[PDB]
Amino acid sequence: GHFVLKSGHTIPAVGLGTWRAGSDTAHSVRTAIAEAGYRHVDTAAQYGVEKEVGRGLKAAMEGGINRKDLFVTSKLWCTELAPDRVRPALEKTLKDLQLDYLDLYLIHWPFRLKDGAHMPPEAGEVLELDMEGVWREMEGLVKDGLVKDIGVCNYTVAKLNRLMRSANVPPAVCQMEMHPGWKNDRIFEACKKHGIHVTAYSPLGSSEKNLAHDPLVEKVANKLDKTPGQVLLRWALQRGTSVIPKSTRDERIKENIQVFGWEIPEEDFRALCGIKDEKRVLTGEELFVNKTHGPYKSATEVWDHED
Ligand SMILES: NC(=O)c1ccc[n+]([C@@H]2O[C@H](COP(=O)([O-])OP(=O)(O)OC[C@H]3O[C@@H](n4cnc5c(N)ncnc54)[C@H](OP(=O)(O)O)[C@@H]3O)[C@@H](O)[C@H]2O)c1
C-alpha cells in the first residue's frame, strides 16, 4: 500500500492527481480521501488549483482524519527556480493549501523561466538554472520542518548525476511520465541505483493519449475482470512505481484505487511492457524550446538526447 523513502517516511502507492481538475478540484479531493480511502494528493502551484485542493483537504480532515495520515505534494515552478524565490513560492503554496507543511516538494522541471515567459519561449526567456543553489535552499525547508522530503520531476540521467554530486539530502522522489508506451526504463534504473523512489505521472496516458481503449489493455482488463484503468495502475505498481491518476468523476476516483489484493499475471505484464516506447505525452517543447534561437532548439535537448 506504500513505498519507503530514504528518510524513512512512507509514500502511499496511489494518490490523486489534480492537473486540469478545474472547478471540480475540491470535490474530487474530498471524495478521494473521505469516501475512496486515498491518503495521497499530488498538486502544484502551476496547476492553478491549489486553493481548491486546500478547501478539499480541509473538508476531508473535518471528520477526524489526521494530517499525519495524509501525504501532500506540491511543486516549485520554473519561474521560481532561483534561491531567493523558493521560500515565497512555498509560502503561497502552503497558504493556498491551508497547510503548515508539505510531505513532498518537487522541482517541477529543471529549467528556469523568466517572468512573463511565452509559450513557446521567446529569445532570452529560458534562464540559467543554479540547480545547486536552488537545491540548497530546498534542503533548508526540510531542516526547518516546512517540507518532510524534497525531490524532482522531469529529470535525465545526466541531471540526476549533477544533483547527486551536490546534494546533502538526496531527492526522495523523481516523478516522471510513465505508462505503457513510455516506460522510461533508463530513468527508472538510474533512480533505482541512486535509491530514489519513482512516482509515475500520466499513468493512464493523460487525456492526450489515454490508454483505457488500447486493445491489449482492454484484453487484459477483460481477462481479469478489471477496468482498463485498474490494469494500467496495477501494472505500474508491479514495476515498483507509485501512481497519481487524475479524475474528476467519482466512480473513477473510487475504481482507480482498487488495485490491491489482485495481480496481473506475468505473461500479461510482459505484453504490456512490450508496447513500444513511442513518444512522450509531455515533451516540454512548448515550455523550453525556441527552434530559431535556442538555447534549446529541439525537444531532444530538453532530455539531454537520452530520449
Ligand atoms: N510535470 C509533471 O510533474 C506532471 C505532468 C502531468 C501530470 N502530473 C501529475 O500527475 C497526474 C496524473 O497525470 P495526468 O493528469 O496527466 O493524467 P492521467 O492520470 O494519466 O489521466 C487522466 C485522464 O484519464 C481520465 N481517467 C481517469 N481515470 C480513468 C479511468 N479509470 N478510465 C478511463 N479514463 C480515466 C481522466 O478523465 P476524468 O478526469 O474526466 O475522469 C483524464 O482524462 C496529474 O494530474 C498531476 O497531478 C505531473
Residue numbers in the entry: 13 to 319
Provide the publication's sentences verbatim.
Aldo-keto reductases (AKRs) are ubiquitous in nature and are able to reduce a wide range of substrates, from simple sugars to potentially toxic aldehydes. The AKR superfamily consists of generally monomeric proteins, typically ranging from 30 to 40 kDa, that are NAD(P) (H)-dependent and share a common (α/β)8-or TIM-barrel (triose phosphate isomerase). Recombinant ZmAKR4C13 efficiently reduced methylglyoxal and small aldehydes but showed poor activity toward aldoses larger than four carbons. The maize ZmAKR4C13 can thus detoxify small-aldehyde stress metabolites and is expressed at sites and times in embryos conducive to a role in stress tolerance and possible signaling.
To identify mechanistic features potentially affecting activity and roles of the ZmAKR4C13, we solved its crystal structure in two space groups at a resolution of 2.3 Å (P212121) and 1.45 Å (P21), respectively. The protein folds into a (α8/β8)-barrel with two additional α-helices (H1 and H2) packed against the α7-helix from the barrel. The residues Asp54, Tyr59, Lys87, and His120 correspond to the typical catalytic tetrad of AKRs according to structural comparison with the well characterized AKR1C9 (64). Although two and four monomers compose the asymmetric unit of the P21 and P212121 crystals, respectively, analysis of their interfaces using the PDBePISA program did not indicate formation of stable quaternary structures in solution. Two molecules of ethylene glycol were found at the substrate-binding site for ZmAKR4C13, allowing us to identify additional points of potential substrate anchoring based on hydrophobic interactions and hydrogen bonds. The first molecule occupies the same binding site as does acetate in the P212121 crystal and that of butanol in HvALR1. Replacement of a cysteine by the bulkier leucine at position 294∗ from Loop C seems to hamper the binding of C3-OH groups that are in the same orientation observed for glyceraldehyde in HsAKR1B1. Supporting this hypothesis, the orientation of the second ethylene glycol molecule bound in the ZmAKR4C13 active site displays an angular shift compared to the first one. Relative orientations of the two ethylene glycol molecules, which approximate aldose fragments, support the interpretation that Leu294∗ prevents longer C3-aldoses from adopting a conformation favorable for catalysis. Analysis of the active site, its modifications, and interaction with alternate substrates, indicates that the spatial bulk of Leu at position 294∗ of ZmAKR4C13 is instrumental to preventing aldoses with 4-C or more from serving as effective substrates under physiologically relevant conditions.
